[PDB]
Amino acid sequence: GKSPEEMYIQQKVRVLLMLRKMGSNLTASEEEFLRTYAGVVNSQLS
Amino acid sequence: AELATRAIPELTKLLNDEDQVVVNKAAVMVHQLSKKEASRHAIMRSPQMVSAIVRTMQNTNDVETARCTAGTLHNLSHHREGLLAIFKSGGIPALVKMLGSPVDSVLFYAITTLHNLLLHQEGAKMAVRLAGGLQKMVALLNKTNVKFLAITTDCLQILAYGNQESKLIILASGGPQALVNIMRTYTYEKLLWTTSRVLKVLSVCSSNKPAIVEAGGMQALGLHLTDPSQRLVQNCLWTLRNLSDAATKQEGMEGLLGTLVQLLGSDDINVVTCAAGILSNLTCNNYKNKMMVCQVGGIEALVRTVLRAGDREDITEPAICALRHLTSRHQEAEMAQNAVRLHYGLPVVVKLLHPPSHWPLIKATVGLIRNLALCPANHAPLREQGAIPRLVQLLVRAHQDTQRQFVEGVRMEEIVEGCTGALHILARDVHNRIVIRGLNTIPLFVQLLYSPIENIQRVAAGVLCELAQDKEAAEAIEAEGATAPLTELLHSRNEGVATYAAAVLFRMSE
Amino acid sequence: DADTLLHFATESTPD
Secondary structure, three states, rough: OOOOOHHHHHHHHHHHHHHHHHHOOOHHHHHHHHHHHHHHHHHHOO | HHHHHHHHHHHHHOOOOHHHHHHHHHHHHHHHHHOOOOHHHHHOOOHHHHHHHHHOOOOOOOHHHHHHHHHHHHEEEHHHHHHHHHHHHHHHHHHHHHHOOOOOOHHHHHHHHHHHHHHHHHHHHHHHHHHHHHHHHHHHHOOOOHHHHHHHHHHHHHHOOOOOOHHHHHHOHHHHHHHHHHHHOOOOOOHHHHHHHHHHOOOOOOOOOOOOOOOOOOHHHOOOOOOOHHHHHHHHHHHHHHHHOOOOOOOHHHHHHHHHHHHHOOOOHHHHHHHHHHHHHHOOHHHHHHHHHHHOHHHHHHHHHHHOOOHHHHHHHHHHHHHHHHHHOOOOOOHHHHHHHHHHHHHHHHHOOOOOOOOHHHHHHHHHHHHHHHHHHHHHHHHOOOOOHHHHHHHHHHHHHHHHHOOOOOHHHHHHHHHHHHHHHHOOOHHHHHHHHHHHHHHHHHHHHOOOOOOHHHHHHHHHHHOOOOHHHHHHHHOOHHHHHHHHOOOOHHHHHHHHHHHHHHHHHH | OOOOOOOOOOOOOOO
């Protein structure tokens, strides 16, 4: 995270992944968001 | 007659003669006279006679004499005056000593005479305890004559009832294991019944309780739940229930659990009530027991039990609790959740949320609904039973209470948390979300965000998170000023609170 | 919402 923007994105990914892990459905927008930032997803997910 | 003036006095003198040979003879004679009423009364009315008999019995070395004197005392114990004379002659200490006798006929006479004293003679219990009778009796539980055991066990019951000191001595003497062994070894109904009563008495003692469970008491008592003897079955159920809150870690419980599920169908209200209570405790945080109970048709049996019980809360509370346990945290929780619906249980479950149900029952019912809502196939039917408006009403009233402790042993904080938790799960369905929002609950959920109780914060953030998955609702939540209180929850140590709160914020702005 | 225990103590006959 080298900016407020990148920080926002990294935490949003983390929150959405945890949300799904806790058993709640994600929205279509969130689904697309996770794809757009698959890289970030894979990072903290790996 | 000549009995008082000549007979008794002569015989009592002979029983003290040095040449014990003339004693064994006198002993025999006295024993015979005790067999006939007239002379039995003459004997019991002679303190010198009774004393000579006691003395002789505990000093003799001639079996025939030991047996005759003990038998004499036995025949005298049938009468009130006889019980008193033996008592005053120091017969209890003597009898107890006779429990160490190698002669079976002597042990039977001694134990039965003591049983009669314990049953009718004032002061008998203390005397037996002081003579160390508890230790002697427990040590005799290894004998095999079932009628003898039935009397001995009953003596222990009489002595242990409401007497902690006695219960602890029985424990220290290995009572629990000896009694459990009897339950697994014999089939004599009277012995099983008397032994189950001793166990019932001990089962309310914090020290004996764990010992009985460790000795295999749960499984042993379970062996008799289908016996034709109703008194036996009921005493086993009572003992089982008392012990149940401390056996959630035993195994080899398949049979016990199977039988208990069957008993739920009984027409005997006490049998069903006890069975529900025991099942509720044994399924409490034990996934293996949860698995087995569902395996043997426990869900259907429990639903039927709730249906039949109606407003009888001694049955519905434990039964609903068992169901709550069974629809959560185990490999078969999902099928259980479905089964409740498949066996037509949803209508009654929701019904229990309304009066005349009392708080404890309401609390368990909300917890059950919360688990049932985890099954998507229960979303529509739960809604169609009117669960949501009632859950909201309960929530609103309870919150208002916490703002103006234990109401029937239930804090309203728990109702607020529970109802919000059920709504949180129900909000997974789009149509339920519409009902929920239409009840104008968003403003309330937002206020719950300020609750000082972490668990309430979690479910409040939780339901808003689900509601926020729909664009319009997310806007409405933001319009309610949720942003500030949510931001304050971002640093919570509780992952749920932190995650749900963050999610609502991301959903409101996206 | 963890599972809960019911505490019973029937030494004679419930009533």
